[PDB]
Each structure stands twice: as C-alpha cells, then as structure tokens.
Ligand binder design. Structure first.
Ligand SMILES: N[C@@H](Cc1ccccc1)C(=O)O
Ligand code: CUZ
Ligand code: CUA
Ligand SMILES: [Ca+2]
Ligand SMILES: [Cl-]
Ligand SMILES: [Cl-]
Ligand SMILES: [Cl-]
Ligand SMILES: [K+]
Ligand code: NA
Ligand code: NA
Ligand SMILES: [Zn+2]
Ligand SMILES: [Zn+2]
Lengths: 574, 581
C-alpha cells in the first residue's frame, strides 16, 4: 500500500520541481510552466508575433522564420523534448504548426525558437514526436490532409493516384528535411520506438483504419542508395510507402486497428505502440518486438502484432505511462482518466479472466491529451499526470463567451490517482511535456557568439562595427543603420537624424552583465518594439515615414530612472 | 482569509492585469492568481484572430497596421465612486492609444489614437458622478506642428497635453496643454478635479536635465473650468483634429484658469487618490517621500485664497528609498512601494499629516520585504469608496531567484499580500510575462458576463450590414457571392460541419469568409483556419466573424475548425493561366 500524497503548494521562496512546456494551441507560442505550482514562468514566441520581445518584428526572428514571417498565426499541439539514449537531454524542444505547415525548434538553454522549417509539398503539420534511441536524430511529423501532387490547380480530385499525404522526417540538428514517406490515408498522431528502427502513426482515412509502421532503417537504406524521387522544387528524398495492388512497400506495414484511431503512444518500457480507439471503446497494443518478424514476412497477418485490445470506456483518445507498468488513458465521452495494467491487458487478450482496470477518475470535462512526468523516456517516474480537458464549464469564474481549457494536475505517485489542481489555460494548449528541474540547464546571459544573432554580427562586421563598444550611425543612400550599446541609465545613441522615407535599422547590444537587467526599444507611433537581454544584440528595421521629432524609449523596466531612458529620432521632411 | 482555491472552488475576485509590452489584457482569478482569459487589444492574437479579422481591424482603424502595444494602466468604469463593471480602459504608450474593453463580452470594442500627442502613459477614470471622462497623459513633449521644421523642446510650441476621452463614445472630449510633461494621473470624488504628476518640468531630453529641478509638480485640473470654456467656445484646435484644445500653461507666472502647479519633489511618479477622497498622494521617487495634497483645499487654491501652492500640501511623510506608488485599504492606511529598498511600507495617512504640522508621531506601521524592486501596487477596491482592505498585489520588476531559471529573460514577480489584518503577510509569488505594470481587482459580484453573443451586437454590426447588401440572412444562409475578383463566402457553423464545405475561386481573388456560429450551447466556440494562408479566427456562440485574404496559390487548400474541434472544408483555386490575363 502506497499513498498519493505529494505536496502541491510551492510557497514564496520555494522552487518548482519540474518544468512544464505547454503548447500554445491556436495562439501559436510555447509556454514554460513550473510544476506542481502550474504557474507560467515564461512565454516563448514561435508562430505568433510577440509585441514584447519583438519576435516577428526583429530582423533576427524574421530571419529564422524565413518567408513564413509573413504569417501572423500558428496552431500548435504537440511539444516534445530531444532525447539521448531514451532520456531527455535538455537540448531542444520541437513543436508543430498545423495552420501554416511548419516545425519549429526551441533551444532550451536560451528558451527561444532558433530554427523553423515549412515542410514542403504538404498541408497541416499536426502529429509530431521525436526519435528516442540512440538519440533524437529525426523529428517525425505528420501532414494531416491529402492533397494533389502537384497542387497546381489542374487536378482537385482527392482520389486521384497522385493525391496523398506524407510522413515527414526532419533532421533535428540541421532543421533540414531528411525524407518523406508517401502513405495511404490521413495521418493523425505518431511515436517512435526505443531502438531507432521503427516509428508508427495512426491513420484515419481509408470498420478498421490502421496504424502504419515505418521501417526507418529501410527508408534510410533507400536514401543512401539513391532509390527515391523528389517532388516539385524540393530536394527532399521522397519514398513511396503506399500499398500497390495489395503488395506492401519495403518501408511500411499497415496494422488494422479500430476505429479512426487517435493517440499513438510508446510505452516507457519500449514494449508497445498503444493506439487509442476513439470510436472503438478500446486501445490496441502493438508488440514492438514482433515488428521485425512482420517486416521480414514471417507473420501470417498484420493483426498478429496486436497483443492487447483492452476495453476501457467511451472515447479513448491518448495514453501515458507511470513507469510502474500502468497506462493512463483519457476517456473523452465518459470524461475520465482510466488507469490500467498493460501486462494484465495482454493476458486478458489471450483469454485470461483478469481485471486490468485499476481506477477511473472523473475529470472536468472531455479530456483530450494527458501526460505523465518523463513518460516519453525510459525514466518515466510515475509522479505527476496532467489531463488537458476541453470544456471547463463551471470550474472557473465566468469570463464571457470564450472559455479556458482545464488542465488538471493529478498525483499518480501512489496506488490511487488524486486530482489536486485545476489550471485554466488559453487557446487550447492541447498537449504538454514535463522535465525534471535538473534536466534543463539555462543560460543566465547571452553568449556574444550565439547563432541566434550571428547574421546581425555579420552585418555589423561589413559596416566595420564592433558591437561591444560602438555608438555609430551609418548612412548608405536612403538606408540608415544605427548601432548602439545600451547600459545602466542611457541608450548609447540618444539622438539621430534621418530623411523622411529613409529605411532605418536600429541594432542594440545590451552590454550590462547583471542577470535579469533586460532592455527594450520602442519607437513611438511606428509599430517598433523589441527585447535586448544581457549580452544580446537585437535589431529592427522600419521606415521613417513621418517627418518631425519621434521619441523612442526603453520598454523593459530596468532601473529607478526607467521613465527617463529615452531618445529622439529627428526626421527631416522630404 | 482563504489563500488556496481548490478544484471545484471559484476565485473570490476578478483581477485585470495589464499585458505590459505584450499588448493584451489578462483576466485572472484572485486569490489563486491563475489566468482565466486573455483579451487581445494592441497585440495580434493568432487564436481569436484579433488583428486579422475584419471586425477587429475595423475597431483598430488605421492603427491595425501596428502589431505591438505597450500597456500599463487598466481601470474599471465607476458610478458614484464604485465600480459598475461596464468597461475597462487601458493605455498604449507605444502607439499612443486608449482602448475600451466591454466587460460583458470580455473583448476590446473601441480604440482611439489620441491626436497630436506621443506616448499615452498615465490613465485613470472619473469617479463621480460616474466615469464620464477617461483621463490620459501623453508623456513626451513634441513640436506643434510636428512637421520637421522645429525640433527644439524649448520652443514655445513644443509641449505635451492632458487628454480627456468621452468614455461612452470613445471620441476625444478635450485636451489641455501643460507645462512640463505628464506621468501618472488620478481623479477626485467630486468630478471637479483631476491631477497628474510631472517629472520633466525642465523640458529636457537627457537624464541629467530631467533631474535638475529640486521640485517638479503635480498639476491640478479644474475640469469644471475646462468644460465651461469648451461650451463657451473658448478653445483652439490643432492640425486636422476637431478636439477642443485649452491652454493650461502659465503665462509670465500668471496661472491659467484650468490648472494649478503644486511643487512636489522629485521626478514624482505615482498619483493616487485616497479612497476616502481626502488626498491626491504623489510618490516622490527621487525624493524619499510622498506628498499629500488636500483635495478639500483645492477650491480655495483656485480661488486665490491661498498664498502659495504648497499650502495645499498637508503631509510629506518620509517613507524610504524610491517611493513609486500608493494604494489604500479603506481603514486609513496607505501602502507605498519602495523601489530601491524593495519593500511595501504601510503608513497611517492621518498621522503623517499630523507629523507635517510638527506633531512628532510615528505614522509608519510596517515595512514588508518584496522580491524585488516593486513598481505599482494595488489593494482590492482601492480606487472606490468601497476599498475593502483584503488583498494587495505588489508588481515587482526583478524576480531573480524566486522562480526556476528560464534563460536570460526573467518573469516579473507579482506578489499577493494579505492585508486584512494589522500585519501584511506575503502569501503568493505570481510570475507574469512582459511586465504587467499595474492591475485592478473587482469583486466577483461586480462583473456580469454574457455566455452567448447578441445578434445585434455592435462588434459585428458592420458585417451584418455588408451581408444585407448581398441579400444575405446570416442566421440561415450558406452561399458564395461573386463580385468581380471578390468572393464573399457566408456560412453558418454548427456540428457536424461547416455550412459551406467547399468553394472554388480564381487565383488572385480576394476572398472574404464570414461565419455565423448558430449553435446555442455555451462553451461551443468554433474556429476557422485556412492552411498556409495566415488565416485564423474564433467564432463564439451567436457571433458573426469575418476574415479577408487573397487566394494567391492555385490548387486545393484545406480549411479546418481550430477551436473545440471532420470539421474541414476545401477551397479550390483555379490557376491564373486558365483565366483572363
Ligand atoms: N492579368 C492582367 C490583369 C487583368 C486581369 C483580368 C482582367 C483585366 C486585367 C495583367 O495585367
Ligand atoms: Cu507605466 S509606470 Cu509606475 Cu505605471 Cu509602470
Ligand atoms: Cu531599460 Cu529602464
Ligand atoms: Ca525633474
Ligand atoms: Cl498521441
Ligand atoms: Cl500503482
Ligand atoms: Cl499612479
Ligand atoms: K523584468
Ligand atoms: Na529555416
Ligand atoms: Na475608434
Ligand atoms: Zn493532439
Ligand atoms: Zn488528440
């Protein structure tokens, strides 16, 4: 007998035990929470435009975003942390954008998005998860929607032979495409095994849909051999993982699974891909150690890799793991989390009369994703569970027609799940991920060599500027490039003069060394705003389209004399 | 007092937090300090489409071109010196705006760019007889006209102005030219007087210059005299703005009808009306004091019955290093942030005034350490004559080691403090993003929200009129209206499907999609995203929302329901080469 009795209060001066990384949902950002307090410590802009830091306005952010900087929106769902040997290594966080078909990488040492890619020749990146073993070499990303190839407006027919969607592999370290695998059907969610050979995804188009399993080794072998095509103007190797006249691809196997299956979750012992049944009141358990036989043609029926199909309740959507042998599954219709024992389910599937269900806990209301601490790793610790519920109804004060999501913290450390905290959140975060405090190591101040602003350092070099010291205004036709340091009471350049119509770039290097002393820069009535934290260089470009005197000021309260940290841009009329 | 709000319990107060440099307003529950909602205002919100939709860009006007704001000062409208829960107003220092939020729908419903000024900072509301005016400070001195011929702040036509906005119409009411500049502002409990601190009586542009004078001032406005001159036509106008402009500067040492200047040290910052209506209290900042202005001495001051403007000061308590802001428990105590000493100091106002008269008395009751460098602070109901003395939030700018490390950028630390007793007790550290400067609390029963939109709501009434020109009944119609290279899609939305599940256009067509959520259930919000076109918006129950974008890519393009949602559809774009060149 072990009780669930962890402390959930983090009082003043006490620190949280875990980091939580929440998807920002339809709002487009990533959020850092402290767990168990469930307080938001930081917002990391990704696909949104952030007025505060200037993400989406600065030259450094728009460089990372590339052409997709033209979009002001994103739709995030699935945040995941890079792994080495099946354990979080604290290097990167990755997240999808369903709205504009992107994957972004966040560097966890600076807590900023440092790379972003628009996945070519697909629409809507939804499902996303990382290779676990030997490390996160690939980011695996589902493109949800079937589209014509090419999508040039000659063919709109979605049953055309060249209409399909694809499974996507991004090189985690370079954030370039690795390869794409054409599949049958629509892709929903995906996960990876604990060896690197296999990955799997639920599919909902084309009484039984499937989980498609990928032999990533076979895909890799084909790419190395050059046995691939390319699509349109993308150099990405494209492999064909569809069935042809009933004949399987080398790259894929289609495992029949009921019914419009949704969640696709790898157990922390590495034994199972568990697909949540959604319309079927079941989960289906695929034995990963039977997949080699499946691909080698030693099994009579792709159904032979199914070793469990527990009946759990109405509307199973997602599954997580406590590392003790239990799975935890959201029941969307019954509005519960059900705790069940995986090996007992496997024995039940063979016909033994054993109850594998341990507990059903009511949640409020209509849970979608759920996440137990370290569940994506072989160190799953069985301490905390968050269930992310879509309808909060009366659980919080009314706030008008739009309601928050209810993210409920549940103590799973003992035999009985216990609901301990209701956390309201904005714009349907949908899913989250937790890490131990000691798995995350952050920088206190920036490195002057940081790649995040290395292109700005390069630009300064071409102008002969030492960013650590210089306060200079460079004139170049109708372009004006202001460079300044900022510290203690004043901007290093307190006034400058331009001509109406000039394109002004302001680059600021914060040379304060004290942690937490962030600077800001706002140009009044010009739509210009950005952050410059200690030892960072930030830059922003705008046109001086209004004659006269225009004030700029430091936005980030950094000193008793904050109100007075200002400068003047004087714009001479045309 | 209950500190922790368990599952199934509700908060006792609403808190409305400024979004700081991030530009939104945030709704929190107090005392849990959890964020219940975000209200987009000056930011572009991917989730609801604020800043992308036609309804939101119509409210923002020309300023819809800006993707940023910088807000500090949220305030709730009042009737007879008590919150009435109708509106929240807030400033934008970055692009010189004031915005109004309707507290029944929890959305920004009006926005104004204040003409002929730069940087709206200080903002507060008339209390009595109700919030007729929104008072807003423009912080920075600029030339008039600001056409690029004169840049000198010492020119006789370089100045800044105090701004009054009609709260109900969200049009300018008047502007008062002042000497110096403007920082924070508050209003009395009669409707006659408003007051603002000034830190730049020097009209300088550099740090040393702004600190030269031993005293700047709080400028006091006789609003009755301003209104009297407006109705008498005794005003001018600047540029193309019709806003009445009154001159509240001194001439050759002679006071204007509209203003008086009370010398106060030094670069004073906070300007806070006591809840009993007795004082404007200016926080001394560079001076380790607050200056207490007796509001009942102001009529005599404006009537020339006092010899020296300092005669309206009846207290100047020495409190500590860097006083910035003051709030009130309704028990006769004031609470002031000490930015340098990093404390909140509780002090008794009537004893501070006695000490000013020389009566040696210790008016300081407690100094509580906060973490670290507090700016604003706010006690529950402090801006009303119902100040209840229960909760206090101090908003500190350096959180240092109070939270887990999250990289070089740190959160702010908004600390909840129990003040219901004689001893202040720190109960909760609340990390927040992007520097909320200030917040405002309301009792749960002071706020009444709608669960479902009204079909005649002015928020989308222009969209209803557009639909009418097309012969469209929005509650029923699922139709595609073609008009040259414009395509206007109108659909209803309710489970199980979009009312229009596919439509075809020509490459380059300008497509407007208008969706009416005809579902009646509450919490059933719909969303709409067009993949790879940067298009996203919310449609809540009985709302009509619309968004306009160019179909610049040939081929098939999926759209889907984001919120609460298969619920998908297809836009088919015929290639330009198959249509007239
Ligand atoms: N495609 C043409 C513009 C055009 C289109 C349709 C009608 C008339 C003109 C170019 O120039
Ligand atoms: Cu803008 S200032 Cu003390 Cu209000 Cu923060
Ligand atoms: Cu930066 Cu004050
Ligand atoms: Ca001064
Ligand atoms: Cl999943
Ligand atoms: Cl257990
Ligand atoms: Cl104030
Ligand atoms: K800060
Ligand atoms: Na990129
Ligand atoms: Na307006
Ligand atoms: Zn999901
Ligand atoms: Zn899901």
């Amino acid at each position: 007998v072990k009780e669930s009795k962890q402390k959930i209060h983090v009082g003043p001066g006490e620190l949280d035990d875990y980091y939580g990384f929440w998807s920002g949902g339809h709002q487009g950002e990533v959020r850092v929470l402290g767990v168990p307090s469930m307080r938001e410590l930081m917002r990391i802009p990704v696909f949104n435009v952030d007025s505060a830091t200037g993400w989406g306005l600065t030259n450094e952010s728009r460089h990372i975003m590339g052409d997709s900087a033209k979009f002001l929106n994103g739709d995030c769902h699935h945040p995941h942390i890079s792994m080495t040997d099946g354990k979080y290594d604290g290097k990167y966080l990755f997240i999808n954008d369903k709205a504009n078909s992107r994957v972004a990488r966040i560097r966890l040492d600076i807590m900023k998005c440092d790379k972003m890619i628009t996945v070519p020749n697909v629409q809507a990146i939804h499902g996303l998860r990382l290779q676990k073993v030997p490390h996160t070499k690939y980011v695996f990303a589902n493109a949800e929607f079937i589209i014509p190839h090419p999508n040039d407006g000659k063919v709109f027919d979605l049953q055309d032979e060249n209409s399909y969607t694809m499974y996507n592999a991004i090189d985690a370290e370079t954030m370039e495409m690795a390869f794409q695998v054409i599949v049958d059907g629509n892709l929903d969610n995906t996960d990876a095994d604990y060896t690197g050979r296999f990955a799997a995804a639920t599919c909902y188009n084309s009484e039984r849909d499937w989980v498609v399993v990928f032999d990533i080794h076979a895909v890799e072998a084909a790419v190395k051999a050059g046995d691939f095509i390319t699509l349109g103007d993308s150099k990405t190797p494209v492999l064909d993982g569809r069935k042809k006249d009933g004949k399987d691809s080398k790259f894929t196997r289609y495992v029949p699974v009921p019914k419009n299956p949704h969640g696709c979750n790898t157990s922390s012992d590495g034994k199972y891909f568990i697909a949540a049944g959604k319309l079927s009141p079941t989960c289906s358990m695929i034995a990963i150690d039977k997949l080699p036989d499946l691909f080698a043609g030693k099994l009579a029926d792709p159904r032979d890799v199914i070793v469990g199909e527990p009946e759990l309740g109405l509307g199973p959507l997602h599954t997580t793991f406590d590392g003790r042998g239990n799975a935890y599954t959201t029941l969307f219709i019954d509005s519960q989390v059900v705790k069940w024992n995986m090996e007992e389910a496997v024995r039940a599937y063979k016909g033994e009369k054993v109850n594998y269900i341990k507990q059903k806990l009511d949640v409020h209301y209509q849970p979608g994703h759920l996440h137990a601490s370290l569940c994506e790793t072989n160190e799953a610790d069985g301490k905390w569970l968050v269930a992310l519920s879509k309808f909060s109804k009366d659980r919080f004060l009314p706030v008008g027609p739009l309601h928050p999501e209810n993210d409920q913290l549940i103590d799973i450390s003992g035999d009985e799940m216990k609901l301990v905290h209701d956390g309201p959140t904005f714009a349907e975060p949908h899913d989250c991920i937790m890490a131990r405090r000691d798995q995350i190591k952050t920088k206190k101040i920036w490195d002057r060599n940081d790649p995040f602003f290395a292109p700005t350092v390069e630009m300064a070099k071409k102008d002969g500027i030492n960013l650590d010291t210089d306060n200079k205004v460079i004139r170049d036709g109708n372009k004006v490039r202001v460079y300044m340091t900022s510290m203690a009471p004043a901007f290093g350049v307190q006034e400058f003069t331009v001509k109406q119509g000039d394109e002004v770039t302001v680059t600021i290097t914060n040379i304060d060394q004290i942690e937490d002393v962030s600077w800001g820069f706002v140009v009044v009535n010009h739509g210009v705003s950005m952050e410059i934290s200690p030892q960072q260089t930030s830059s922003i470009t705008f046109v001086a389209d209004k004659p006269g005197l225009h004030w700029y000021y430091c936005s980030w309260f950094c000193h008793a004399l904050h109100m007075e940290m200002v400068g003047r841009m004087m714009v001479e009329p045309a």
